[PDB]
């Protein structure tokens, strides 16, 4: 609540300022992972999806790491189910690291998709 | 051989102030006693921050000035921005070799940002003379006392603006080949500002 909110803003601003499109100190992958789980607890699933899409257009820290944050996120929505399943569609179409080639180890890309397919089939 | 001859307003000046130079003129061409021109542009740009006042024969000053304009355009593009002293020499060269046909009384006044404002006065026959301020034409002797005594360096723009408007408006009254508009040109680093005041204005003010 109040905790999630302070923590999320602080780690987010600093990661963007250090990492940039070119390093000044950067932020490790751990820093962005922390930020991700903070923002999922904080605010709604549609807002998480939107904020993640917007970051990833910069360059990320690398395209691979972006796929790792998707993969986590997908699992979490599938735990909760119902309307949360609807949002799963939403992450996938918006972020082009998992709907288009941006890199050539994209095993995580095929895997996310198969998770979505399985649900759709239900 | 030129048939008839022409004359200009013969009380011209460049005055240094706080941040540069303010250049001041009366303008009037007559051809005899026919008033060829009420107003004139004889407030001549020879470069973007370096203007001049032209006096003497209209035909001759304009013909020279055009040549000076060509050299100082070419001069800028190649050898870097001029100086007031650079412009002044070019004007002089053209007068001196052809002082057999030319009558040009020139004040070239320009602003540089490491010399501040500069006045170089080139009389008839042509010689470069650096002064901190100038008055020229033939009406200048009569205001020599005023000009020397009230000339002050680093005077407020408002105060210099009054001083030039007044300086000329007195000169124009007592002298007879003077007349028409008073036009003034402020040269600082912010650019070039143009003033025109008509007869009915300046006489009064």
């Amino acid at each position: 609540a109040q905790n999630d909110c302070n923590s999320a803003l602080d780690q987010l601003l600093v990661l963007e300022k250090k990492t940039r499109q070119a390093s000044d100190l950067a932020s490790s992958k751990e820093v962005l992972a922390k930020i991700v789980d903070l923002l999922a607890s904080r605010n709604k699933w549609d807002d998480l999806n939107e904020q993640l899409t917007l970051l990833s257009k910069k360059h990320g820290q690398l395209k691979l790491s972006i796929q790792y944050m998707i993969q986590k996120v997908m699992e979490y929505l599938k735990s909760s189910k119902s309307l949360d399943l609807n949002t799963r569609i939403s992450v996938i179409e918006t972020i082009r690291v998992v709907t288009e080639n941006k890199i050539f180890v994209e095993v995580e890309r095929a895997r996310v998709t198969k998770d979505l397919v399985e649900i759709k089939k239900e | 051989l030129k048939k008839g001859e022409v004359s200009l307003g013969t009380s011209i000046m460049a005055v240094t102030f706080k941040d540069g130079v303010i250049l001041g003129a009366d303008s009037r061409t007559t051809t005899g006693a026919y008033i060829a021109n009420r107003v004139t542009d004889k407030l001549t740009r020879v470069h973007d921050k370096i203007w001049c006042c032209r006096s003497g024969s209209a035909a001759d000053t304009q013909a020279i000035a055009d040549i000076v304009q060509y050299h100082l355009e070419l001069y800028t593009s190649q050898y870097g921005t001029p100086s007031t002293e650079t412009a002044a020499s070019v004007f002089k060269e053209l007068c001196y070799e052809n002082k057999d046909n030319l009558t040009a009384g020139i004040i070239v006044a320009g602003y540089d940002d490491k010399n501040k404002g500069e006045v170089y006065t080139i009389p008839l026959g042509g010689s470069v003379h650096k002064l901190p301020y100038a008055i020229a034409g033939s009406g200048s002797t009569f205001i020599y006392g005023y000009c020397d005594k009230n000339f002050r360096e680093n005077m407020s723009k408002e105060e210099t603006v009054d001083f030039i408007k007044h300086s000329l408006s007195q000169a124009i009254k007592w002298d007879g080949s003077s007349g028409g508009v008073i036009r003034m040109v402020v040269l600082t680093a912010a650019g070039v500002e143009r003033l025109i005041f008509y007869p009915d204005e300046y006489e009064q003010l």
């Binding site: - | 190649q78 870097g80 002293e85 650079t86 060269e93």
Partner: protein
């Protein structure tokens, strides 16, 4: 033998005719000259080779003035250098008479520069084949320029050329980097001597005579002067210090 080696009345498939390329190659097997830009001046130095005891010390000079405040030294083919300078003079004087001022270094550079380009667009008029390090001080600072065979010139902050170029450039960049640009004009004289002394290590089957000059705004008072007397002894002292001695 293609008419891209016997004529310059055409453009080449390499964008330059072979003979101009060859001028660049002949500067480098030559004699060493440097130029050091500093925050208030420029310093020039050239290595004068000693081949006999029949030569006289400093009664043959390679650094020649243009005007009174621009100093010119060049490396490469001797005749071509005389002709370049003679021209350099005619421009300089024409400028002083005509505008009533000593000539700017970016201006002076455009005038020599256009003339080196001219002799490189005709099929029977010889190219130049000297690289000229030149410069001086004017009313908005000090400037160091270097002119090439091909008509190529840019402003430099350090410049080096010749046999011992590699060595020279190494020491020279270290010192320039270390300094704001080159520190004082005075410090730069000694430094300059070390580079020339260091370059001489690349050719010990001959002797040298160190020759320095300078042109500095407040440390020559706008003039170009030869560096001599005490100031030459001191730069020698510094040089023989580091390169052991």
């Amino acid at each position: 033998g293609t008419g891209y080696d016997l004529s310059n009345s055409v453009f080449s498939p390499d964008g330059r005719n072979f003979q101009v390329e060859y001028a660049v190659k002949a500067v480098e097997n030559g004699t060493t000259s440097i130029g050091i830009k500093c925050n208030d001046g420029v310093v020039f130095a050239v290595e004068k080779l000693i081949t006999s005891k029949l030569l006289v010390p400093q009664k043959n000079v390679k650094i020649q003035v243009v005007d009174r405040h621009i100093g010119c030294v060049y490396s490469g083919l001797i005749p071509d250098g005389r002709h370049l300078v003679n021209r350099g003079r005619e421009e300089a004087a024409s400028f002083k008479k005509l505008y009533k001022t000593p000539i700017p270094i970016p201006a002076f550079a455009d005038r020599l520069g256009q003339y080196v380009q001219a002799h490189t667009l005709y099929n029977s008029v010889r190219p130049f084949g000297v690289s000229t390090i030149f410069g001086g001080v004017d009313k908005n600072g000090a400037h160091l320029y270097m002119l090439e065979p091909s008509g190529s010139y840019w402003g430099y902050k350090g410049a080096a050329t010749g046999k011992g170029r590699q060595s020279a450039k190494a020491e020279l960049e270290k010192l320039v980097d270390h300094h704001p640009e080159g520190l004082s004009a005075r410090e730069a004289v000694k430094q300059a001597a070390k580079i020339i002394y260091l370059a001489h290590e690349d050719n010990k089957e001959k002797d040298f005579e160190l020759e320095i000059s300078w042109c500095s705004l407040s440390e020559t008072n706008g003039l170009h002067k030869f560096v001599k007397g005490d100031l030459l002894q001191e730069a020698i002292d510094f040089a023989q210090k580091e390169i052991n001695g």
